[PDB]
RNA sequence: CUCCGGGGAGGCGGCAAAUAUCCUUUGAUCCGGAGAUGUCUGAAUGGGGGAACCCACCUACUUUAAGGUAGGUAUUGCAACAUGAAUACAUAGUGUUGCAAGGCGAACGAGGGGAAGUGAAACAUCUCAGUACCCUUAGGAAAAGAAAUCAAUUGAGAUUCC
RNA sequence: UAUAAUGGGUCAGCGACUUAUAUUCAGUAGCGAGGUUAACCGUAUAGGGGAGCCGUAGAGAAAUCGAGUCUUAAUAGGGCG
RNA sequence: GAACCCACUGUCGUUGAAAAGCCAGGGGAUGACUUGUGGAUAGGGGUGAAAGGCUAAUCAAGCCUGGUGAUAGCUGGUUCU
RNA sequence: AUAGCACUCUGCAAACACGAAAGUGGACGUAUAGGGUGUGAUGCCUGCCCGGUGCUGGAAGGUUAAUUGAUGGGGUUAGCG
RNA sequence: UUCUAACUCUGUCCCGUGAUCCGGGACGAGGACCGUGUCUGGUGGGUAGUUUGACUGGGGCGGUCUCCUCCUAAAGAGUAA
RNA sequence: CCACAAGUCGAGCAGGUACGAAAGUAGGUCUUAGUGAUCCGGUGGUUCUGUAUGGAAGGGCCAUCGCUCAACGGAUAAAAG
């Protein structure tokens, strides 16, 4: 399913409002997508499936820091 | 449950002591065309009439 | 980003100069080519530190 | 069916009488507590399947004939051990052992989604209503909870309920 | 509506202005310029519990005044009392 | 032109032998044919050599249970002196 | 409905359809193929109109969205009075 | 205009592996495009909820809908089509 | 005059004013048609209010502006068959 590995996010449920202020169900979805990161350590490529705030934080964190983090919460990377 | 007041009313309706007060209409606009008249006598509030006074006792209970 | 260049760069430096580059840049070239580092405090005290001169006779 | 305790003239459950064999003061029937046995289906878990059926494998003991008795054989997660590619180290993968989980069931709790009939004397904002319903998952309760909170004489002092 | 307008083949049994809360008026009882407690405690219809509510003052949109007050330059006039 | 598959005309039947038939005639009958068994498509959906046809004797939106005791300025009814 | 005819789309991870997605049909096909639309064996044939609506190809003038934020006008107060 | 390193391949080869799924590895062709998220303009009976007045010698069509003057109006006021 | 909401006539008092020598006359035009409630906002004033306090924003009061709401007591800001 649609969900962030680093963050957490997911599609959240809110309103389409017209000018009439008609209001109808609609979902806001993230920015999500798979990207293939270097891990030095183990000599090898990881893909996640992840947002770009989950690449701003891998930016300030080390790809090191936030895949030790993930493991700790048992995702099997 | 309580009686709920009529919102609507209790902006337009406030008690004295006999009875209860009201402002006029006509004053809004459309002021030009009227006579000094009828825009001084058109100022100021006057009294519920008593053929509505009872309408005006079931949509404000409480005040 | 800011990146510490490990070794020359034919426009950014040469050999530890701290240099801001588009973050796609550094992410999907230098860092995991080894060409640069990131400019946190500890990586610095990593580079100044010891390796410093090691990096430097390793001019080629 | 067994043991312990209670009880003391009858009893062999009911519809449901009747009969025969009988049991019982050497303590019956009956009552309470603790054990033993406990076919097949069903989460059903050795494989399969149209539920209560069809077909098996391995180990030990036993029989002499085409068997019997006892045990083991599901999946997933975790841990230990062994093994192990592309590919040199490794990793993925694979196997064994041990532990745990799944399913059912009233209401109350927490969370993920979420109507319309109706009212507005029409109807779209609004209402109905975060209701009905669907989904996930606890406990005897749950949730909340110890101020980056209120108040406005500078005062109160966590949360919950009336 | 005798109506050729509706309903009932007949009998027996069942079948339709309720309940809760709030409010106003009438009757009745207690107390009376006062009346009354709610939650809650309570070997519990008692006794405690006065927070709160209604009445005792009005005028003005309001600040404000108050048997007065608003309007106004006005102590005039006028409206609510 | 028989079996088989259809359904053009007429009488009968219409509280039927039958909630669609009997009888006498009628059309196709080696093909775009008929048929058994077992499967797939599910309700604003399916399928349709297309009639809004069919989807369990139900179809301009199937059936069942819930919202639900929907709402009805309409019709009926409303019991002793 | 039909064989026949015509227009049109589609260069393949095709257009098109189902689905939320993954994916599936098209098709284990490749413009002599596949989808949509109309006409309806065959014979003779199929005239005029591009003003309207649509489609296809141009053009870079006018108008216009988010985004960006130049200027101008107020609120507050250190200070001056 | 070049490039590769994000990213694409319903292209070839190798391994997991007894496998036209998938994953990893090696190539090849593309490549900062395509494509996706948020915001934003256009289009949008494909789909959805609704609206579409009253008087009236039945309804529809036609006419009318508020105000002033005269008559009907029966010597006060009022009085319908 | 009148269901309400509205509508009509008005002597007289105070202030300022115009024309008359003066007594005086003048609160639109011989009169009866020339019209639109509420909500929501705009503008000019204001000794009212101002969510800790001083301000301010916003609101109130007085004057005034925007409807062929003509189905003219005006069901929505927004609707055909
Ligand atoms: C990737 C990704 O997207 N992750 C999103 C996670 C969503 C989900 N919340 C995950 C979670 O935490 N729990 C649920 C995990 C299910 C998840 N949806 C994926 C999955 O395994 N589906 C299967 C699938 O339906 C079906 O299998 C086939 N072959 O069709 C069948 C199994 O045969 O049932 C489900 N499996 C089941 N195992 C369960 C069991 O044993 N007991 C209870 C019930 O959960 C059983 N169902």
Redesign the pocket.
């Known amino acids: 399913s649609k969900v962030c590995q680093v963050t957490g996010k997911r599609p ?2 809110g309103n389409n409002v017209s ?5 109808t ?1 609609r ?10 990161f270097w891990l030095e350590s183990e ?3 990881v ?1 996640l499936r992840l947002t770009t705030k989950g690449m701003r934080i891998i930016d300030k964190l080390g790809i090191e820091k936030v895949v030790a983090d993930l493991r700790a919460q ?1 995702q ?1 990377i | ?3 709920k007041t009529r919102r609507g009313a209790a902006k337009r309706f ?6 209860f ?1 009201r402002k ?26 008593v ?2 006074v009872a309408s005006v006792r079931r949509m404000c ?1 409480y005040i | 980003m800011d990146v510490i260049l490990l070794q020359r760069i034919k426009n950014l430096g040469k050999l530890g100069d701290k240099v801001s580059v588009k973050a ?2 550094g992410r ?2 230098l860092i995991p ?1 080894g060409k640069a580092v990131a400019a946190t405090e500890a990586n610095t005290a990593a580079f100044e530190a010891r390796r410093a001169e090691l990096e430097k006779q390793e001019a080629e």
């Not at chain 1, 979902?27 to 293939?36: A, I, K, Q, V, Y």
């Not at chain 2, 406030?14 to 009875?19: L, V």
């Open positions: 959240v449920v000018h009439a202020n008609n209001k169900k979902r806001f979805e993230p920015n999500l997508h798979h990207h293939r000599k090898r490529f893909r048992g099997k | 449950a309580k009686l406030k008690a004295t002591a006999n009875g007060k006029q209409a006509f004053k809004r606009h459309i002021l030009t065309k009227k006579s000094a008249k009828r825009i001084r006598q058109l100022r100021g509030c006057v009294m519920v009439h053929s509505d209970p | 796609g840049y999907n070239f080519q």
